[PDB]
Design an enzyme around this catalytic site. Structure first.
Site, mmCIF file in Angstrom:
data_model
loop_
_atom_site.group_PDB
_atom_site.id
_atom_site.type_symbol
_atom_site.label_atom_id
_atom_site.label_comp_id
_atom_site.label_asym_id
_atom_site.label_seq_id
_atom_site.Cartn_x
_atom_site.Cartn_y
_atom_site.Cartn_z
ATOM 1 N N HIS A 114 134.634 102.308 -24.427
ATOM 2 C CA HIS A 114 134.722 100.913 -24.013
ATOM 3 C C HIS A 114 136.016 100.626 -23.247
ATOM 4 C CE1 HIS A 114 134.108 96.475 -24.473
ATOM 5 N NE2 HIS A 114 135.432 96.494 -24.438
ATOM 6 N N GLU A 115 137.151 101.015 -23.820
ATOM 7 C CA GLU A 115 138.426 100.731 -23.169
ATOM 8 C C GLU A 115 138.583 101.449 -21.832
ATOM 9 O OE1 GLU A 115 138.853 98.202 -26.252
ATOM 10 O OE2 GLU A 115 139.732 98.199 -24.248
ATOM 11 N N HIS A 118 137.191 99.589 -19.018
ATOM 12 C CA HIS A 118 138.133 98.628 -18.449
ATOM 13 C C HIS A 118 139.191 99.322 -17.581
ATOM 14 C CE1 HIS A 118 136.679 95.205 -20.686
ATOM 15 N NE2 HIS A 118 137.077 95.655 -21.862
ATOM 16 N N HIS A 124 133.288 92.931 -19.108
ATOM 17 C CA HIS A 124 132.319 92.947 -20.192
ATOM 18 C C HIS A 124 130.897 92.760 -19.720
ATOM 19 C CE1 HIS A 124 135.580 92.112 -23.424
ATOM 20 N NE2 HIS A 124 135.399 93.404 -23.212
HETATM 21 N N1 LIG Z 1 133.874 91.704 -34.797
HETATM 22 C C1 LIG Z 1 133.735 93.020 -34.921
HETATM 23 O O1 LIG Z 1 132.657 93.563 -35.076
HETATM 24 C C2 LIG Z 1 134.988 93.835 -34.836
HETATM 25 C C3 LIG Z 1 135.777 93.742 -36.135
HETATM 26 C C4 LIG Z 1 135.433 94.890 -37.073
HETATM 27 C C5 LIG Z 1 136.548 95.054 -38.076
HETATM 28 O O2 LIG Z 1 136.732 94.141 -38.910
HETATM 29 O O3 LIG Z 1 137.237 96.094 -38.036
HETATM 30 N N2 LIG Z 1 135.799 93.353 -33.742
HETATM 31 C C6 LIG Z 1 135.331 93.350 -32.504
HETATM 32 O O4 LIG Z 1 134.225 93.749 -32.192
HETATM 33 C C7 LIG Z 1 136.288 92.808 -31.496
HETATM 34 C C8 LIG Z 1 136.156 91.294 -31.386
HETATM 35 C C9 LIG Z 1 137.372 90.672 -30.707
HETATM 36 C C10 LIG Z 1 137.069 89.272 -30.228
HETATM 37 O O5 LIG Z 1 136.350 89.128 -29.222
HETATM 38 O O6 LIG Z 1 137.555 88.313 -30.852
HETATM 39 N N3 LIG Z 1 136.164 93.396 -30.180
HETATM 40 C C11 LIG Z 1 136.997 94.351 -29.817
HETATM 41 O O7 LIG Z 1 137.884 94.774 -30.528
HETATM 42 C C12 LIG Z 1 136.828 94.847 -28.429
HETATM 43 C C13 LIG Z 1 137.944 94.099 -27.696
HETATM 44 C C14 LIG Z 1 137.872 94.407 -26.220
HETATM 45 O O8 LIG Z 1 137.035 93.895 -25.509
HETATM 46 N N4 LIG Z 1 138.756 95.283 -25.772
HETATM 47 O O9 LIG Z 1 138.713 95.612 -24.425
HETATM 48 C C15 LIG Z 1 137.012 96.362 -28.342
HETATM 49 C C16 LIG Z 1 135.779 97.218 -28.452
HETATM 50 C C17 LIG Z 1 134.469 97.067 -28.219
HETATM 51 C C18 LIG Z 1 133.875 98.298 -28.522
HETATM 52 C C19 LIG Z 1 132.431 98.670 -28.449
HETATM 53 C C20 LIG Z 1 131.981 99.865 -29.002
HETATM 54 C C21 LIG Z 1 130.630 100.202 -28.936
HETATM 55 C C22 LIG Z 1 129.740 99.338 -28.312
HETATM 56 C C23 LIG Z 1 128.293 99.623 -28.201
HETATM 57 C C24 LIG Z 1 127.379 98.593 -28.379
HETATM 58 C C25 LIG Z 1 126.018 98.829 -28.273
HETATM 59 C C26 LIG Z 1 125.573 100.106 -27.978
HETATM 60 C C27 LIG Z 1 126.492 101.125 -27.797
HETATM 61 CL CL1 LIG Z 1 125.951 102.720 -27.426
HETATM 62 C C28 LIG Z 1 127.853 100.895 -27.903
HETATM 63 C C29 LIG Z 1 130.185 98.154 -27.762
HETATM 64 C C30 LIG Z 1 131.522 97.832 -27.832
HETATM 65 N N5 LIG Z 1 134.800 99.135 -28.912
HETATM 66 O O10 LIG Z 1 136.035 98.455 -28.851
HETATM 67 ZN ZN LIG Z 2 136.623 94.964 -23.773
#
Ligand SMILES: NC(=O)[C@H](CCC(=O)O)NC(=O)[C@H](CCC(=O)O)NC(=O)[C@@H](CC(=O)NO)Cc1cc(-c2ccc(-c3cccc(Cl)c3)cc2)no1
Ligand SMILES: [Zn+2]
Ligand SMILES: [Ca+2]
Ligand SMILES: [Ca+2]
Ligand SMILES: [Ca+2]
Ligand SMILES: [Zn+2]
Length: 159
Positions: A114-115, A118, A124
């Site tokens: 994901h990172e 970016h 996104h």
């Molecule tokens: N809410 C949650 O589920 C978790 C918290 C879990 C915890 O408590 O630890 N936090 C997040 O998801 C946060 C939310 C932050 C917010 O918006 O307030 N999101 C992130 O940390 C993102 C932040 C970002 O955008 N950084 O650039 C980071 C992130 C996005 C993913 C990514 C990986 C795989 C998939 C995926 C989804 C569907 C299919 C597939 Cl193959 C893969 C799509 C997203 N990995 O890291």
């Molecule tokens: Zn992101």
């Protein structure tokens, strides 16, 4: 339509290592994450240990020198800068998470895919199957595939 690297050879350097995992597993996760994107673009990625890398991979905590402070365990897991010099391209991972090779904690490989998206210029996605979707979800990493939306996005930027 974010910024792009104006070259197809891109270097990365792992600035530091989370104590959550052993060093070889961090290297492996990051290498595999880059490979995901190289598989569908003309981009090539080489790891360097010294010199001036394009993409710096960093584990840091809380307020860590940029305008994107972390928030402790949970919440935001990582963030990255789009292509550009210096801090541009760099990918930062919140050390207050527990990084893993598996389904427990936060999977480093998936987060890195994901990172790095970016770091290459992607924003996104609204598709919940896309790795560029805003919220982390664990998927069996052995069967992981970029979604068609991710491939569309990255191929629109490179090639
Ligand atoms: N809410 C949650 O589920 C978790 C918290 C879990 C915890 O408590 O630890 N936090 C997040 O998801 C946060 C939310 C932050 C917010 O918006 O307030 N999101 C992130 O940390 C993102 C932040 C970002 O955008 N950084 O650039 C980071 C992130 C996005 C993913 C990514 C990986 C795989 C998939 C995926 C989804 C569907 C299919 C597939 Cl193959 C893969 C799509 C997203 N990995 O890291
Ligand atoms: Zn992101
Ligand atoms: Ca950089
Ligand atoms: Ca956090
Ligand atoms: Ca940690
Ligand atoms: Zn940062």
């Amino acid at each position: 339509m974010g910024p792009v690297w104006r070259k197809h050879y891109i270097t990365y350097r792992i600035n530091n290592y989370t104590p959550d995992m052993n060093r070889e597993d961090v290297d492996y996760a990051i290498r595999k994450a880059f490979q995901v994107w190289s598989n569908v673009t003309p981009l090539k990625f080489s790891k360097i240990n010294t010199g001036m890398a394009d993409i710096l991979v960093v584990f840091a905590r809380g307020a860590h020198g940029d305008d994107h402070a972390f928030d402790g365990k949970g919440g935001i897991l990582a963030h990255a800068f789009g292509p550009g010099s210096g801090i541009g391209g760099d990918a930062h991972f919140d050390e207050d998470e527990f990084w893993t090779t598996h389904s427990g904690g936060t999977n480093l490989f998936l987060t890195a895919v994901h990172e790095i998206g970016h770091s290459l210029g992607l924003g996104h996605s609204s598709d919940p199957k896309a790795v560029m979707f805003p919220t982390y979800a664990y998927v069996d990493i052995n069967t992981f595939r970029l979604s068609a939306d991710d491939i569309r996005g990255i191929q629109s930027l490179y090639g």
